Design a protein around this ligand. Structure first.
Ligand SMILES: CC1=C(c2cccc(O)c2)[C@H](c2ccc(OCCN3CC(CF)C3)cc2)Oc2ccc(O)cc21
Ligand SMILES: CC1=C(c2cccc(O)c2)[C@H](c2ccc(OCCN3CC(CF)C3)cc2)Oc2ccc(O)cc21
Lengths: 235, 224
């Protein structure tokens, strides 16, 4: 019973949208590698709690095994963080709206070694959605595709589960086209926009893998005392 | 040559298909981590020469600057190796057809530290295309999308020239979308089944981008 009308599916996915969280950003003290990463980490960890709540209201998702729901989130979480980040940043050219009181330009990216690479990509993806005129109904469908699609490629039970996920992606495809039909695009423009949107999910998968490679290099590069750390122990 | 009918575009892309290359595999000298990686490297480097020849016969590609053709290949090469590898492996469940004389099962993957991880993914993607019943006309369209799509979100996006080039690439991806649907229409799928199949195909390009990045992380760890 995730086989509901296209208008029901959009309504369901709009409802499930998590809140737009606030940072505890301190505007008086300037940034540092340690402090900016600390800020963004706290934010991201808060968003992860709200994303699990969301995941449970996405039609089809709850129907799966727990092991499978865990697996799809483990595989999708940074993708969903990033499409979310990019969606909020549409109204603010050249900048990423990490939170309504936390708006970073490309140059503030450089405050973290090799973070600019991922910023430029997120900024580019933002620019793209803007020029596309991505609608919020389209946005929520993409978020759900990313959750269901990104874990699915990794017994009778496991087969019926893959098949259930594929049935739901079909429903969401149907919904996306319904939105495009309703918005008055020709059939050609419908298939072409559906294609342009799904091709972007591939750039978002790439942005994620790069981001993930970056986050790991930051954990690795603290098998070693910091300046901030060694400072206090004398002081 | 954005004037190409759907039947012309498929014919063009089928023509451009490279030959299925041979490995220097010597069945009179046992397997080795060193030797199998040496084999695969030699093969892949030979395929890269054939891929450039192909790339030049993909409609639109030649119209770009050299810098841009280079950039798209720099970003797409391992993706195209892998979709190629996956396509050839469809008819051989559990095994990867690296070449007609080089057919490795999952277990021969273990002969290289952490290579099984990438084998299982390529095998899974093979399983997927099989259950989809991917046609060779669909295959060649995906190959072309991967080349044109995977570099396009970098370029630079800050001069009149690079803008006209991004716009040209986007016009061609639109043409290839049109082609894919035409093939599905011709094969007699309903409109619903057409957009659903188009979606299922493009969602796999996402797994192929993922498989590539993992593969690339693996290739780096082997230079050691
Ligand atoms: C894209 C992006 C970030 C970003 C990401 C990569 C590179 C980069 O430069 C910035 C970092 C970030 C920082 C730390 C992260 O992970 C912390 C670890 N927790 C544990 C849990 C996994 F188990 C995640 C994730 C993202 O700040 C964000 C905050 C909110 C948001 O919507 C997106 C981001
Ligand atoms: C899936 C796959 C590979 C594969 C890929 C990743 C992981 C894995 O386990 C296997 C390796 C491989 C090994 C080395 C490679 O390149 C190294 C050097 N080349 C030349 C150029 C430098 F100038 C790069 C490329 C592919 O063998 C292949 C051969 C042909 C083919 O269609 C695909 C592959």
């Amino acid at each position: 019973a995730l086989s509901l009308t296209a208008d029901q599916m959009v309504s369901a996915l709009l409802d499930a949208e998590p809140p737009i969280l606030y940072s505890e950003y301190d505007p008086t003290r300037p940034f540092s590698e340690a402090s900016m990463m600390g800020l963004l980490t706290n934010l991201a960890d808060r968003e992860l709690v709200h994303m699990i709540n969301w995941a449970k209201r996405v039609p089809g998702f709850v129907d799966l095994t727990s092991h499978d729901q865990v697996h799809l989130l483990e595989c999708a979480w940074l993708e969903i963080l990033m499409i979310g980040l990019v969606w909020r940043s549409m109204e603010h050219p050249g900048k990423l709206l990490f939170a309504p009181n936390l708006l970073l330009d490309r140059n503030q990216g450089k405050c973290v070694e090799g973070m600019v690479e991922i910023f430029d990509m997120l900024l580019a993806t933002s620019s793209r959605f803007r020029m596309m005129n991505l609608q919020g109904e389209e946005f929520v469908c993409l978020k759900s595709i990313i959750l269901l699609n990104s874990g699915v490629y990794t017994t009778l039970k496991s087969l019926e589960e893959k098949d259930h996920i594929h049935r739901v992606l079909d429903k969401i495809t149907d919904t996306l086209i319904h939105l495009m039909a309703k918005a008055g695009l020709t059939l050609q423009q419908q298939h072409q926009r559906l294609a342009q949107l799904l091709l972007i999910l591939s750039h978002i998968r790439h942005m994620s893998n790069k981001g993930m490679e970056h986050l790991y290099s930051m954990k690795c590069k603290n098998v070693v005392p910091s300046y901030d750390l060694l400072l206090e122990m004398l002081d």
